[PDB]
Coordinates of N, CA and C and ligand atoms in Angstrom, one line a residue:
X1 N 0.9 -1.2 0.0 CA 0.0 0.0 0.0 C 0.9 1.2 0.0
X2 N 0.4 2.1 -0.2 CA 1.2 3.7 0.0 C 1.5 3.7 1.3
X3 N 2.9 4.9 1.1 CA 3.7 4.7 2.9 C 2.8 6.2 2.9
X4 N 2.2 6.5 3.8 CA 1.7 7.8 4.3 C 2.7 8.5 5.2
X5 N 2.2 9.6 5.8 CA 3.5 10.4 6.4 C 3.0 10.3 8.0
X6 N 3.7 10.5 8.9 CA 3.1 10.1 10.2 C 2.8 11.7 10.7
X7 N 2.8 12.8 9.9 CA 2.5 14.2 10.1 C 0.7 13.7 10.3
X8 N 0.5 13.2 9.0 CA -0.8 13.4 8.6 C -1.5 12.2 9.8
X9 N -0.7 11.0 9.8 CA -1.7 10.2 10.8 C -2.3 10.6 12.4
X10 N -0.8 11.3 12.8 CA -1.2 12.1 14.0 C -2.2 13.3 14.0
X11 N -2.3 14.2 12.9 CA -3.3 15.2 12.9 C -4.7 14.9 12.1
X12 N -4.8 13.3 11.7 CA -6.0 13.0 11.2 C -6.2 12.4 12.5
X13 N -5.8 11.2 13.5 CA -6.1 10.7 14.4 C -5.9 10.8 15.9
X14 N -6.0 12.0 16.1 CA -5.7 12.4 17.5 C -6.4 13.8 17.3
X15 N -7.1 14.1 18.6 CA -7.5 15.3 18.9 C -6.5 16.5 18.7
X16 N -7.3 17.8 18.2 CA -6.2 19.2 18.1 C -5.6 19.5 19.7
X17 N -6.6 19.6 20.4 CA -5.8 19.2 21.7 C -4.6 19.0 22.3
X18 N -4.6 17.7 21.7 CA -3.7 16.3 22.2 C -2.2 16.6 21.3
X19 N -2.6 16.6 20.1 CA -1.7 17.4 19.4 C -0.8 18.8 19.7
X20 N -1.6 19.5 20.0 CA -0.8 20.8 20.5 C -0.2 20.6 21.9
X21 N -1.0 20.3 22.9 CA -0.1 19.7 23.9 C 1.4 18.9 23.4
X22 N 1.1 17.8 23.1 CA 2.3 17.0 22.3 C 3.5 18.1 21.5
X23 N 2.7 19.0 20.7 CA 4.0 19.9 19.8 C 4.3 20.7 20.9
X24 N 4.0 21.3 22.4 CA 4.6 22.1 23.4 C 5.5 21.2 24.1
X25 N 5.2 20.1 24.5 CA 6.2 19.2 24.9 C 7.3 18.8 24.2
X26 N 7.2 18.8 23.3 CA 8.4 18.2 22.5 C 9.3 19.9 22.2
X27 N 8.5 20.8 21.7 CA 9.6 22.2 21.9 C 10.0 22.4 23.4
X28 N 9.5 22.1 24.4 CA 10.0 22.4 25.9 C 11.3 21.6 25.9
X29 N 11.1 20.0 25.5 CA 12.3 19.8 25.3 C 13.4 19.3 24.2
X30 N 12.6 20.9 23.2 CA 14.1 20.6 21.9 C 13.9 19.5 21.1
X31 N 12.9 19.4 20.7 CA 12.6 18.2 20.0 C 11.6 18.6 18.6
X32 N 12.1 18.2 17.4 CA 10.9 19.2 16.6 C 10.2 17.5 16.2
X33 N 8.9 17.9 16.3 CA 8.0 16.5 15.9 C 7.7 16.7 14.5
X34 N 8.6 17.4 13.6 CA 8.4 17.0 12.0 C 9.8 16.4 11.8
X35 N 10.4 16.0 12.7 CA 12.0 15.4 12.5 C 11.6 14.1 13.5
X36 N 11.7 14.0 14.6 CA 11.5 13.0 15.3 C 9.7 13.2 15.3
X37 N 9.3 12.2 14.4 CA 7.8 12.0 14.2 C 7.2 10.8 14.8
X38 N 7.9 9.8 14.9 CA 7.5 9.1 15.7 C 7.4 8.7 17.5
X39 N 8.5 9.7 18.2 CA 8.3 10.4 19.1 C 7.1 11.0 19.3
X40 N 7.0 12.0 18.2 CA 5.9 12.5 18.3 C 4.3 12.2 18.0
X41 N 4.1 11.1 17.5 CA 2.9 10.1 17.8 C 2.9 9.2 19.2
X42 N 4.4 8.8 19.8 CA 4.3 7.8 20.9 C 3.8 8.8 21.8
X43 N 4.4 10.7 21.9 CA 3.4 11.3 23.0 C 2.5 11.8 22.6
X44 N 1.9 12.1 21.9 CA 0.1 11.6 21.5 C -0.3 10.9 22.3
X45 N -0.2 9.6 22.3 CA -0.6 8.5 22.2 C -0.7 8.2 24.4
X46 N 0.6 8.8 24.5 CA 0.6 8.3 25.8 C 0.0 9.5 26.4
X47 N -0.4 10.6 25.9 CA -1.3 11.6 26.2 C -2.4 11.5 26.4
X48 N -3.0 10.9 25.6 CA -4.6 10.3 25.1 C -4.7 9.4 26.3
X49 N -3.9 8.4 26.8 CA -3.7 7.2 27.4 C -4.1 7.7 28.6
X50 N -3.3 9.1 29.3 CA -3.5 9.5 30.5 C -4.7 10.2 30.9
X51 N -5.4 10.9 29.5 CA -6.4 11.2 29.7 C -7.6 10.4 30.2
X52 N -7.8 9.3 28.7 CA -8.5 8.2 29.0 C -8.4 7.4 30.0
X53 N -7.3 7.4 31.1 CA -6.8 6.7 32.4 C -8.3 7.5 33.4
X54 N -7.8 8.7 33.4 CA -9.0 9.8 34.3 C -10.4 9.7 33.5
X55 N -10.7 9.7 32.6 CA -11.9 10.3 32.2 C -13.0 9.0 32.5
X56 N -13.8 9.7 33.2 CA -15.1 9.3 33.9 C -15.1 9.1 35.3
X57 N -14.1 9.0 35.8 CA -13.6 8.6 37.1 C -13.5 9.9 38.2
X58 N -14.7 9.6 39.4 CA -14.7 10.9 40.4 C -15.2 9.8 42.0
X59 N -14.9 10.6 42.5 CA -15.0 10.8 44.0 C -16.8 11.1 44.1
X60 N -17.5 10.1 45.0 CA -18.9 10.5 45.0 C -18.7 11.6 46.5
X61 N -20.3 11.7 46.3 CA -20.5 12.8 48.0 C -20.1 11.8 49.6
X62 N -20.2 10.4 49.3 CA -19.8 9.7 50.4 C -18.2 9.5 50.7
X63 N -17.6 10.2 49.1 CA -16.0 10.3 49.4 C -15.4 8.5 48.8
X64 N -16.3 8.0 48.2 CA -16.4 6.8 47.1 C -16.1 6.7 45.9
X65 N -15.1 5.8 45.2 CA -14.7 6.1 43.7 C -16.1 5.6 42.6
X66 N -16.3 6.2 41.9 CA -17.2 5.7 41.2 C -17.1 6.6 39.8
X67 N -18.2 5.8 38.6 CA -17.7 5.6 37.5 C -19.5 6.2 36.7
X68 N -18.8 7.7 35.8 CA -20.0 8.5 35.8 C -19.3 8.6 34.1
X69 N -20.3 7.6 33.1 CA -19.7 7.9 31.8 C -20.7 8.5 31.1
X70 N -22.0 9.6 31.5 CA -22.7 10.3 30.9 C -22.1 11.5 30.7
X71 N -22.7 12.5 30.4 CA -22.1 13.8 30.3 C -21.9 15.0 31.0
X72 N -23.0 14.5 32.2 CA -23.0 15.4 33.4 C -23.0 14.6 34.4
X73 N -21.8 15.0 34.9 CA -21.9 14.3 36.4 C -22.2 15.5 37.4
X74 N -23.2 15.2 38.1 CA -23.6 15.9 39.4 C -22.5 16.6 40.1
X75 N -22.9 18.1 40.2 CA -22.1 19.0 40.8 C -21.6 18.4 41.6
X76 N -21.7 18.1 42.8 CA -20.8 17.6 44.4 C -20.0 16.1 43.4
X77 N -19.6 16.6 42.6 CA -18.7 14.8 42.2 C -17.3 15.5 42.2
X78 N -16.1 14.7 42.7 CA -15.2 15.5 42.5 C -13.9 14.7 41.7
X79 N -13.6 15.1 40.9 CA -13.1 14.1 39.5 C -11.7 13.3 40.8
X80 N -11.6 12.0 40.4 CA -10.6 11.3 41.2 C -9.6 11.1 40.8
X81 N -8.8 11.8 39.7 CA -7.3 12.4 39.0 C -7.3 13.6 39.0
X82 N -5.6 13.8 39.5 CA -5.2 14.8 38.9 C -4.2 14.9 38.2
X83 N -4.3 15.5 36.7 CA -3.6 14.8 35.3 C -2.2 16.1 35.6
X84 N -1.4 15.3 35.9 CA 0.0 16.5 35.8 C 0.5 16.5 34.1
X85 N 0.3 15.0 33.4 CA 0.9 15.2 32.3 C 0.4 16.2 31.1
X86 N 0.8 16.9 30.3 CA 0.2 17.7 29.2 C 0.7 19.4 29.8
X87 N 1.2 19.5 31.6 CA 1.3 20.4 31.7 C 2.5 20.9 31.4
X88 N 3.1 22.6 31.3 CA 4.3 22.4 30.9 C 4.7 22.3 32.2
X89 N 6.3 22.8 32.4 CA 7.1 22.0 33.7 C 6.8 23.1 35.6
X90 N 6.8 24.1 34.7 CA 6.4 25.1 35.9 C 5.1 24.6 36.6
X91 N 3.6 24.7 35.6 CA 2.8 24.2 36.1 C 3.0 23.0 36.5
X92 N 3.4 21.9 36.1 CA 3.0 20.6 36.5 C 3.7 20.2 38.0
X93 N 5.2 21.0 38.0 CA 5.4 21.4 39.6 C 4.4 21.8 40.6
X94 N 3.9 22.9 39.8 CA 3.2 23.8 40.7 C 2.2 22.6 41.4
X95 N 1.6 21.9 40.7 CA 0.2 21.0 41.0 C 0.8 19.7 41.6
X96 N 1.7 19.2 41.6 CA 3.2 18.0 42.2 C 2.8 18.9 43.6
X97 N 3.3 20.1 43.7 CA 3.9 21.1 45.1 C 2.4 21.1 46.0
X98 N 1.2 21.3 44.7 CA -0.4 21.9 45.9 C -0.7 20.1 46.2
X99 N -0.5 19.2 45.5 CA -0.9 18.0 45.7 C -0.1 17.8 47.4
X100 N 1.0 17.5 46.9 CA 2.1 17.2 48.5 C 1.6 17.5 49.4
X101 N 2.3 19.0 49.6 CA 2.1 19.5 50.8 C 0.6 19.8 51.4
X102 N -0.2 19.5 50.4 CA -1.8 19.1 51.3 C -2.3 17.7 51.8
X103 N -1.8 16.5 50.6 CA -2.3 15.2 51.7 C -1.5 14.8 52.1
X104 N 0.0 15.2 52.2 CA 0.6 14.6 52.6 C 2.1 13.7 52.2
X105 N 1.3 13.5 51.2 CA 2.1 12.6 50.3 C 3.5 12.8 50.2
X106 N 4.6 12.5 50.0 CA 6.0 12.7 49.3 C 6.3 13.4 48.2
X107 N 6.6 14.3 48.1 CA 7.6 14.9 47.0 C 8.4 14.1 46.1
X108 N 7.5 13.5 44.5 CA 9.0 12.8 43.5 C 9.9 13.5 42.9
X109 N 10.1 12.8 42.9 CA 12.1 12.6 41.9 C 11.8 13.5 40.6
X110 N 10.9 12.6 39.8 CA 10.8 13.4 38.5 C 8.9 13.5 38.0
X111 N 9.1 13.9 37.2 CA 7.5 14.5 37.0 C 6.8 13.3 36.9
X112 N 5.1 12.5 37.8 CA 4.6 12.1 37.6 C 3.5 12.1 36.4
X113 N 2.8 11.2 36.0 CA 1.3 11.8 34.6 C 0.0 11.5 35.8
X114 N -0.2 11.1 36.9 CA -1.3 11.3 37.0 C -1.5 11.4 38.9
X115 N -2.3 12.1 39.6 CA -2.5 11.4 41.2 C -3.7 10.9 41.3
X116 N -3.9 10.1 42.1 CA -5.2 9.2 42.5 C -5.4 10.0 44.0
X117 N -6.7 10.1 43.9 CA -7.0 10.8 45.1 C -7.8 9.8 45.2
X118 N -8.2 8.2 45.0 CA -8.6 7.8 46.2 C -7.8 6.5 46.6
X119 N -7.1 6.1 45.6 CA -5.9 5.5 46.4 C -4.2 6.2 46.9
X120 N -4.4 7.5 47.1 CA -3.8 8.5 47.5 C -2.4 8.3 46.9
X121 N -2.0 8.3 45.4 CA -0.6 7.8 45.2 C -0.3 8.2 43.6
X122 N 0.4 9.1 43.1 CA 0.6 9.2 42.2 C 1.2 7.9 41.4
X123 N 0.7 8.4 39.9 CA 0.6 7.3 38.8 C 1.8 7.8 37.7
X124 N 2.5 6.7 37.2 CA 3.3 7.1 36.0 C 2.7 5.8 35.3
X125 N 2.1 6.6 34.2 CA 1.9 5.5 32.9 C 3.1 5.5 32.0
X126 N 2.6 4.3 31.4 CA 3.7 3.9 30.1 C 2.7 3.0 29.0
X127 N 3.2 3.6 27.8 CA 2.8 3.0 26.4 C 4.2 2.4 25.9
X128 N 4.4 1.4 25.4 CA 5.0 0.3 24.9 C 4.9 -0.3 23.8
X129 N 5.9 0.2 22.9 CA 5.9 -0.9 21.6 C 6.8 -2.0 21.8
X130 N 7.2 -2.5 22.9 CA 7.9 -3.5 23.1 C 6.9 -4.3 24.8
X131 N 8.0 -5.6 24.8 CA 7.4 -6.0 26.1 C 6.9 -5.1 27.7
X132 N 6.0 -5.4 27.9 CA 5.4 -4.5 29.2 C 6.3 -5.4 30.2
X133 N 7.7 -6.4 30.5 CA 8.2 -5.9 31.7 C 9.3 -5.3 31.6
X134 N 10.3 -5.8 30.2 CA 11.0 -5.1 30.2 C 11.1 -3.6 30.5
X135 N 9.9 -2.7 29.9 CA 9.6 -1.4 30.5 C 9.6 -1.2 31.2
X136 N 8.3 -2.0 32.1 CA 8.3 -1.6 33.5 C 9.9 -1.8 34.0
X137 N 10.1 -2.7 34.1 CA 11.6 -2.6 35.1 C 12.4 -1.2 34.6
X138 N 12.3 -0.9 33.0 CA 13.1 0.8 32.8 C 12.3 1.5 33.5
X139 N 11.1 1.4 33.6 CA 10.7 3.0 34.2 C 10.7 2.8 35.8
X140 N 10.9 1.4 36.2 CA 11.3 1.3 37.5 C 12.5 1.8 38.2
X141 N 13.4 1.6 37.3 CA 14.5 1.8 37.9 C 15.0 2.6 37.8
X142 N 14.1 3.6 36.6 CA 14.9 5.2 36.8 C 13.8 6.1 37.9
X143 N 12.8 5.8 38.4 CA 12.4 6.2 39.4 C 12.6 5.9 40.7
X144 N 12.1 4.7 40.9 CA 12.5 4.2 42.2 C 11.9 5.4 43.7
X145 N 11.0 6.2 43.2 CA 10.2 7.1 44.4 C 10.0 5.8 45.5
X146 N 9.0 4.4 44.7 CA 8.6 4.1 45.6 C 7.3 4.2 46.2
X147 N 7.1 5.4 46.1 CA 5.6 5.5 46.5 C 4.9 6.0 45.2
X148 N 5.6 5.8 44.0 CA 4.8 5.9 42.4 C 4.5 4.7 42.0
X149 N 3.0 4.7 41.8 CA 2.5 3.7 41.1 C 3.0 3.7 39.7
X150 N 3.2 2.6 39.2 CA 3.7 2.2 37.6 C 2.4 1.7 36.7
X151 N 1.8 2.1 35.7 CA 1.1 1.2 35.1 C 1.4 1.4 33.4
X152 N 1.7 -0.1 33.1 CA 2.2 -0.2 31.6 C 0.9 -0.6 31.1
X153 N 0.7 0.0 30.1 CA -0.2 -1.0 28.5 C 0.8 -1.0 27.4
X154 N 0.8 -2.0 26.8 CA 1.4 -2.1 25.2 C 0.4 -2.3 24.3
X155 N 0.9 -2.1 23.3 CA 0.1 -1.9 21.9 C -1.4 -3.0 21.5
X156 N -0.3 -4.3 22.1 CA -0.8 -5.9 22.2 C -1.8 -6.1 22.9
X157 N -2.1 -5.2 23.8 CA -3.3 -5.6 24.6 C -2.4 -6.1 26.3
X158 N -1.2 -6.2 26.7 CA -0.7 -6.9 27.9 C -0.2 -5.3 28.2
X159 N -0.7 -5.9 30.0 CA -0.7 -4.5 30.9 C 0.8 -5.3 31.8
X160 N 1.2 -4.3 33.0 CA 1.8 -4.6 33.5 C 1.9 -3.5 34.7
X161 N 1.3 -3.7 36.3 CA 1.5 -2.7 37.3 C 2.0 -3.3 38.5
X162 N 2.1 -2.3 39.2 CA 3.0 -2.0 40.3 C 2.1 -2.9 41.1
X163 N 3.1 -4.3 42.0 CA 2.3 -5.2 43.0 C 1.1 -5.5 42.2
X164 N 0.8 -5.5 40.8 CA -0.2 -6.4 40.0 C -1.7 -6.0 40.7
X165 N -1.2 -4.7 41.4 CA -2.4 -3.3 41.3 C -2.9 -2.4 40.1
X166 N -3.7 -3.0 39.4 CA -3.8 -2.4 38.0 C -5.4 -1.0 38.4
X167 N -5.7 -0.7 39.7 CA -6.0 0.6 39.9 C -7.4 0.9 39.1
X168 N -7.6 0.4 37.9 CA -8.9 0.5 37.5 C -9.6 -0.7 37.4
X169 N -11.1 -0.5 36.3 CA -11.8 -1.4 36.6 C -11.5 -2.0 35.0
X170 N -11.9 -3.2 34.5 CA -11.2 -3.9 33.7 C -12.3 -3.3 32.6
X171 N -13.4 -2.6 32.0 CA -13.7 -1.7 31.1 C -12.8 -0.9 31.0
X172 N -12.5 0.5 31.7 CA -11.8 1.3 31.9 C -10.3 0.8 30.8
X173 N -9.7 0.1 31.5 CA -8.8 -0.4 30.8 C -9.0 -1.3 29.4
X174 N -9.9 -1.7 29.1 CA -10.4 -2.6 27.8 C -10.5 -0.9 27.1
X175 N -11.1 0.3 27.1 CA -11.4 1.7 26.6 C -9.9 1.9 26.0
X176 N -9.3 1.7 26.8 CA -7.5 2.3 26.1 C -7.0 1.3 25.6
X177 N -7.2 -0.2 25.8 CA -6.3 -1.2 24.7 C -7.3 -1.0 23.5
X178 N -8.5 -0.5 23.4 CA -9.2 -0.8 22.6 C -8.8 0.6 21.4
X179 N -8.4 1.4 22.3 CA -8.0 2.6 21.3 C -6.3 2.6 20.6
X180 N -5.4 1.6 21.3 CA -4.0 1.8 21.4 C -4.1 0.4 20.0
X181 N -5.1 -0.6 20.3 CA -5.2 -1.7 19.5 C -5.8 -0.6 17.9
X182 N -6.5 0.3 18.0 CA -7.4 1.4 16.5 C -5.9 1.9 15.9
X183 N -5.3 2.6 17.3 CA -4.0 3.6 16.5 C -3.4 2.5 16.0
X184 N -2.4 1.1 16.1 CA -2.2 0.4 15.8 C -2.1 -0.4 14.1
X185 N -3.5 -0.2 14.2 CA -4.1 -1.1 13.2 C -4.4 0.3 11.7
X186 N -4.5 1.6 12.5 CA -4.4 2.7 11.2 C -3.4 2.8 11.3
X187 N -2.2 3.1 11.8 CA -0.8 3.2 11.1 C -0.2 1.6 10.5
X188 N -0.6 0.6 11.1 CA -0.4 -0.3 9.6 C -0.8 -0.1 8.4
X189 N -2.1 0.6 8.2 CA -2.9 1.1 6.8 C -2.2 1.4 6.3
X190 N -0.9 2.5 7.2 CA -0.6 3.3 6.6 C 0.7 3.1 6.2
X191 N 1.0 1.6 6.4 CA 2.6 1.2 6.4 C 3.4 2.3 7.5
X192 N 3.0 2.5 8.2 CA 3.6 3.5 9.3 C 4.3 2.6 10.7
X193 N 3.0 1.2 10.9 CA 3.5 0.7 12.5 C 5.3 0.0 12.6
X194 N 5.5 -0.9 11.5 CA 6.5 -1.3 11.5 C 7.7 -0.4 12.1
X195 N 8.4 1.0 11.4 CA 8.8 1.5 11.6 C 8.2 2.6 13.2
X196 N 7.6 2.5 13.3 CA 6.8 2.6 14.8 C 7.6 2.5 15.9
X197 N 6.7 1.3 15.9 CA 7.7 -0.3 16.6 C 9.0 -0.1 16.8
X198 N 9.9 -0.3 15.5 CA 11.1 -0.2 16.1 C 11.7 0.9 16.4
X199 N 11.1 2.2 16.2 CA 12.1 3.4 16.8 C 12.0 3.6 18.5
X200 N 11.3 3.0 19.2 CA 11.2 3.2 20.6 C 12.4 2.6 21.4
X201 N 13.5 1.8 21.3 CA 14.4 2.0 21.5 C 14.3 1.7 23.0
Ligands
MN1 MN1 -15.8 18.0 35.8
MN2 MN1 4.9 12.1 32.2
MN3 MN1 4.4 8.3 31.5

């Protein structure tokens, strides 16, 4: 089939959003995503992932996690993430700094993507075009906080978390392999995944 450009797959298949977050990130750190382009679809991608991690998920009035996938959730609901990733680095400190030093929690090492306010513990996701433990053990071992939750998905459909605490409910997570499995299957269309795949390194 025709090789398509991965300019076009990312700005056909991902939100303008997601996108513009992704091209701030990659200029924050010196990175142009018309040169390193598949970088710049893997943060997309793990962008999308962190969102989709949060979205529907709040804290009820009895202080209960629960799961509101209509469009309005009732004023007194109070969403049960707080998404540090997508922010740039000042902000995303800033919200690291108001998280801490209010419940308590520990100060990390390096920037987490998400906190759980009802298992009180910040999250670092990972997307994987390779095996989910090999990863995990990389993103283990260059953190090592300790008190960060790890949770891997790969492309394949195989997760992989911290103490085999996988933190959500098994829809929730079927919602993101089901979308990681769509990007997937349209950059093969596009003759794009192969070379995908192997640039993650
Ligand atoms: Mn809301
Ligand atoms: Mn992050
Ligand atoms: Mn991450």
């Amino acid at each position: 089939g025709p090789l398509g450009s991965m300019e076009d797959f990312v700005r056909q298949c991902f939100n303008p959003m997601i996108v513009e977050l992704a091209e701030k990130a990659m200029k924050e750190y010196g990175e142009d995503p018309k040169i390193e382009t598949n970088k710049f679809a893997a943060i997309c991608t793990h962008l999308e992932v962190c969102f989709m991690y949060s979205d529907f998920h709040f804290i009820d009035e009895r202080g209960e996690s629960i799961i509101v996938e209509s469009g309005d959730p009732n004023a007194l609901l109070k969403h049960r993430f707080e998404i540090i990733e997508g922010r740039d680095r000042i902000m995303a400190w800033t919200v690291v700094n108001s998280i801490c030093n209010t419940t308590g929690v520990e100060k990390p090492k390096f920037l987490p993507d998400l906190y759980d306010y009802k298992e009180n513990r910040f999250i670092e996701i990972g997307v994987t075009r390779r095996e989910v433990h090999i990863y995990y053990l990389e993103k283990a071992n260059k953190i090592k906080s300790e008190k960060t939750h790890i949770h891997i998905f790969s492309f394949t459909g195989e997760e992989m978390a911290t103490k085999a605490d996988y933190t959500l409910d098994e829809e929730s997570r079927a919602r993101i392999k089901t979308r990681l499995f769509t990007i997937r299957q349209e950059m093969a269309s596009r003759s794009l995944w192969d070379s995908f795949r192997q640039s993650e390194r």
